Amino acid sequence: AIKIGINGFGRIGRLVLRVALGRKDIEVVAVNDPFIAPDYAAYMFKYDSTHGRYKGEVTASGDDLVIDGHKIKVFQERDPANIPWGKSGVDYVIESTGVFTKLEGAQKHIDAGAKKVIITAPSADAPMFVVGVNEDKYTPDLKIISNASCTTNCLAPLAKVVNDTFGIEEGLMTTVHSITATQKTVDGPSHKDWRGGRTASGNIIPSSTGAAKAVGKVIPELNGKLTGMSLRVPTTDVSVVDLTVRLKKAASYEEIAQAIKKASEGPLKGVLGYTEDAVVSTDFLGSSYSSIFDEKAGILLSPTFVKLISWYDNEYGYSTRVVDLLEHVAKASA
Amino acid sequence: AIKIGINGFGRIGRLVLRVALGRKDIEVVAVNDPFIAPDYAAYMFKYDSTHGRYKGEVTASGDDLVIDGHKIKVFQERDPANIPWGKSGVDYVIESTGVFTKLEGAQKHIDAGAKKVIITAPSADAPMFVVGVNEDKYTPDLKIISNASCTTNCLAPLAKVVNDTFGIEEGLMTTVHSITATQKTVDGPSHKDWRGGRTASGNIIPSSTGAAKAVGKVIPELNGKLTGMSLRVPTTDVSVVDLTVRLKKAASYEEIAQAIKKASEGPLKGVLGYTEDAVVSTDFLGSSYSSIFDEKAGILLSPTFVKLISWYDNEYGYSTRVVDLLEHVAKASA
Amino acid sequence: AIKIGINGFGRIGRLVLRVALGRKDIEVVAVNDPFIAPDYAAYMFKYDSTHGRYKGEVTASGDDLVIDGHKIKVFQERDPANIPWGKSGVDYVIESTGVFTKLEGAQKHIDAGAKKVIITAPSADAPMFVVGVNEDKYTPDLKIISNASCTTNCLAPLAKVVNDTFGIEEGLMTTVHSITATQKTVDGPSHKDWRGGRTASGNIIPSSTGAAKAVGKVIPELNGKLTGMSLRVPTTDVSVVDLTVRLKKAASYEEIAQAIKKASEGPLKGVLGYTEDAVVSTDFLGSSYSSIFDEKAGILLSPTFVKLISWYDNEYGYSTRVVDLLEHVAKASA
Amino acid sequence: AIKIGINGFGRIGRLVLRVALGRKDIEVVAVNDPFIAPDYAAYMFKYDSTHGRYKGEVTASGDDLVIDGHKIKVFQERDPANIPWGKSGVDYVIESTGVFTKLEGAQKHIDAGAKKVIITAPSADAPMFVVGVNEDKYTPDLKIISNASCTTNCLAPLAKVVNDTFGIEEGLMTTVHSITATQKTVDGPSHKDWRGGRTASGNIIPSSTGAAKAVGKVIPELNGKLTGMSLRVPTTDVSVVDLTVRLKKAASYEEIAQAIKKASEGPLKGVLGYTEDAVVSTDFLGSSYSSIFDEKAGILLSPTFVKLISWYDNEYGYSTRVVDLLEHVAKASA
């Protein structure tokens, strides 16, 4: 029994719960969010503007969120050191607040009695993992780890296949990315990111991202070879990586597509998907892939210079990978 | 001769400044916003997703926002008691934070050296005014007043005409309303208003509003005769009042429309507008009216039961009224 | 078996197919759409921006659309008289083009060998039915019938309960309505509906509707007692009825809600739904109800004057009713 | 006087009229659109969801569109051969229907009595020009020409500066592009572009474009050195070029920015703009530039491998260029 708690009952926290409730080996013991009371947590979990109503019975009773008859404790602590993880029997904490992304903050959960923490974001200092790429490098002494970003989980599996087969010499990427909770409904204050304060649903908004650099951390051979940027656009979920790369070995576009298709059918099955259909972003709502290569959308300019397109449900694909990483950690430590 | 300061440099604060800079007798001395430094204030005023670039020169210099040569001091105080309104020579404070809407909160501005405060919102206890309806009832001894809500400013002039002519027995109102800064880009916490936390750009969102009942405060004879609710929809600005009203006297629709046209040409000129064109919400972006009657959109069922439709730029029409009420207070107080 | 064909493979045509595939008594023999070839029909049926991917295998094979092994003939006839319904063994035609909504056009399906036609829209000509309101008035001599509009299917069950219990004296309705295929992505020509040509996703757009007067056709006692209008807003599916009604018998809001709840649990089960939750439009994506009463959103101004709010998935609830009406017609004619 | 007519009174046709009415030497004699009657033409010209109301008097009288006293004949011919251009004294036709983009189609305007045609789109046939880049290659023996695409007009001035100063070895472009009139409000038939049939306001939609390869026609030294693709996103106007380019000569990003700033201040003034502000797409609504380099948004991977960002109001910048090309052609003609 993988006994877990969730800190930060937001987009990622609530969807990680949806995914986790479908895994036989996982018991979600408790969640913590100081802004969400038990009855409110039942409301937020049951109804979802992006991914539909939860197919199951959702209520609250006292301090319990009750889903299909399973009782989940709801705590409301601003300070993770005050969450009763150990007294509740929680061994793994999903750290999905966006607030405790460094080792020093995430360690508070272990102080509070958990054993291990998975940060659902890039971490400035916790080791980072992408399932399908380097989760095999996880060892049980690592108590606090990061599942990287949603963009890194799209880019890294694709870059892995391309680099393995043809070699990546250099690459620049853009993610055309759905809006998120950090943005504003109308022009408002965002002192740390002026563009990000502008009306989210009315603008294309250039943004920064460390996701391309981060690929060189989970694929050390690509260290320093990739960088990138983001354009936030008025869709509510699903994002797309636009990867422009110089290759070491010359290829045709068909050969590149065939290498990606082969990986998607074998070692990257369930992580890297493949399509030749006339897909659009809504076609990936609820997709569990980290990366779906759009074969028809990309374009080759030279035998060593190509643009590759790959989709990802930044909320739900990533949330699935959180749970996958959790189960790999529990299996590797058993 | 009117020396004002602006607290809360947001949608209303910044657009009130836009309007004020166009008024002879107004000198904007300072603004206060603890989240917006001077250089950031210049950026937020210059560029607007809804109302376009400020046609003028906007820069910052030290602690001054500089607009077409005029220097405006920028304070950053969370507590209005700490704002040097008096030392700066500010006589009037435009209270547009949404946080100090009661006499208790707005009085802090006077304790800080200002003389009078106009709250850009309904107030639980401050006297309320709607230009064109009851601003002549303002008396100079009133130091803290409210300019009501954008919705009240749309409904009250319309209701005043209908009541003055045919009489209003009772009326139920819906405002189909653009999203505002209190809403969320994706499903997030909103513990005082659960529907309002849901994805703003992807939902029709019911919301309570006292704006129809508040008409009874500015039109005492309509006390208890109007109420209603709101539906927030994914437009970024401009809203519409849908007033279903029972009349005391039998009328034809042509008769109602003529009465409204007469009012808009005479005593409510510039406040109540009138159109017979095939208008949609974007046609009122930047409109200075409080209320624009849409003659072709309404429908009569019986001679005493009719549905009336009136548009309003909830940001800019209201902001213009804020400045209009300020100039009336100053004049009445001379 | 109920052997059917679908004319017009659009939003309604394709969602009617989705519903019908879940009904054991129905065999979908064929579809016709001159603008959609077989492989394109497979794509349009498989991928849906609003209702997700079809959960099942969708391919095309020569002239057949193939869904979970069941083959469906695809015709491409502009003129319904040329569709080989009789030769194909089709007895019922779902007429969902929007082009053939009168008896004269719909009869061409019967000339072509079908037995009966259900028009998925109001008809100037053909008798109209709303399941849960008057489908037991269907008699087998009626060969061509209309399932009314999506708004009429939301308003009529609600009006039936309120009129049955308290009596409706008069009522005025607004539907705040999602955009549809007749609208335009940017300001474009719509010479019969000038407002309807303006940018659909950027505007609140007033529109005329006969849906409230049509209630008086399916509930004859309400003939002449209801009318209304529409406001199109930038959501892509789900709409809401805003009914302002004068009652004959006085009541509390709670008594009104209780009458609707009882109907929803009894004679209008599956047609009229009932909620007290903090719902928004996306919470009814895929709902099979015609009408979901929003208990917390309405408001009462006098014991005989109240505003009632009811939701509907204008695409999917209506499409479910089309199939329900079809099964009622087949059973009534056996 | 440059006497002109406009064929296709759409987004480009109407905005070309707005621009042309501000040029002293141009007389707009007539417009043609079989779907827009004279009074409807006045409505569509007067009200604009994207660019506001026309600041001027707009009426219709008989068969004339009347703008600030100037009468413009309104024709309604589906076949341009039937437009009485000659009898009306029109010398230059702006061909903005999207339907007559080849020499054979546009020639009908000359058979009907016009002298020269400017197609407001790429042509498979007609020589293409981009103002600021190659309009000095226009010669008056050319009777039918193309102003290329809005994306080519953004990319070409940028590529010219970069190629002139550092040399372009090769480049791959993505345009993140606002929706246009060819898209659909909900999933509908688009048999030649399946992705383009999907819900425009709810999807990121990949699309082909020859815009980058077309730069090689107006800058022949760049033939075969650029290509790219498009992602349509739910904004109603303004688009952005994302150019990933390999340089021949090593550069710092600062030298690149400085070269573009210099060109924007001299030989490309009014065509190529330059900004270092925290801009988003709405900040370029109504901009007359072909291309606005976003200095802060771009990123450098190596001294010869860089990503450059440039904005454009695809409707209004391009419409202004159509009028600029017209005046250049007329100066060289007659």
Ligand SMILES: NC(=O)c1ccc[n+]([C@@H]2O[C@H](COP(=O)([O-])OP(=O)(O)OC[C@H]3O[C@@H](n4cnc5c(N)ncnc54)[C@H](O)[C@@H]3O)[C@@H](O)[C@H]2O)c1
């Ligand atoms: N949304 C995405 O697409 C996405 C994808 C991958 C990763 N992430 C990352 O996951 C994290 C969460 O993202 P989100 O999109 O779910 O954000 P969110 O804002 O939806 O959720 C954050 C939650 O944290 C809660 N919270 C805030 N302070 C807290 C505290 N002190 N203790 C406990 N709970 C607290 C909030 O109430 C909220 O419910 C962020 O690091 C983000 O970068 C987001």
Ligand SMILES: NC(=O)c1ccc[n+]([C@@H]2O[C@H](COP(=O)([O-])OP(=O)(O)OC[C@H]3O[C@@H](n4cnc5c(N)ncnc54)[C@H](O)[C@@H]3O)[C@@H](O)[C@H]2O)c1
């Ligand atoms: N359409 C409208 O937006 C509209 C119309 C009429 C009235 N109003 C009302 O006007 C008020 C402001 O609304 P808004 O839409 O401009 O909101 P907003 O969020 O755009 O602006 C509020 C501003 O107040 C600032 N602020 C927050 N706390 C502060 C403090 N302690 N001291 C000083 N400044 C502070 C914020 O930083 C922000 O800039 C609200 O009461 C609102 O109900 C809004």
Ligand SMILES: NC(=O)c1ccc[n+]([C@@H]2O[C@H](COP(=O)([O-])OP(=O)(O)OC[C@H]3O[C@@H](n4cnc5c(N)ncnc54)[C@H](O)[C@@H]3O)[C@@H](O)[C@H]2O)c1
């Ligand atoms: N969308 C809704 O919410 C809704 C709800 C209730 C009723 N309706 C009604 O249903 C009908 C269709 O609506 P929709 O929204 O599905 O529209 P749609 O445009 O999505 O579908 C109409 C289909 O008819 C096809 N078609 C056109 N001409 C044809 C012909 N001559 N023969 C066969 N097929 C043809 C089109 O190619 C298209 O696929 C309309 O009458 C509409 O008013 C729509």
Ligand SMILES: NC(=O)c1ccc[n+]([C@@H]2O[C@H](COP(=O)([O-])OP(=O)(O)OC[C@H]3O[C@@H](n4cnc5c(N)ncnc54)[C@H](O)[C@@H]3O)[C@@H](O)[C@H]2O)c1
């Ligand atoms: N951003 C842009 O919208 C943009 C930018 C650059 C170029 N263009 C190009 O300009 C052209 C028009 O684009 P638009 O966006 O203005 O399209 P639009 O659909 O807004 O306008 C096209 C107009 O042509 C009219 N029309 C159709 N058939 C006709 C005929 N036979 N005779 C006369 N008029 C006819 C239509 O009624 C419509 O008003 C296209 O070639 C397009 O690719 C568009």
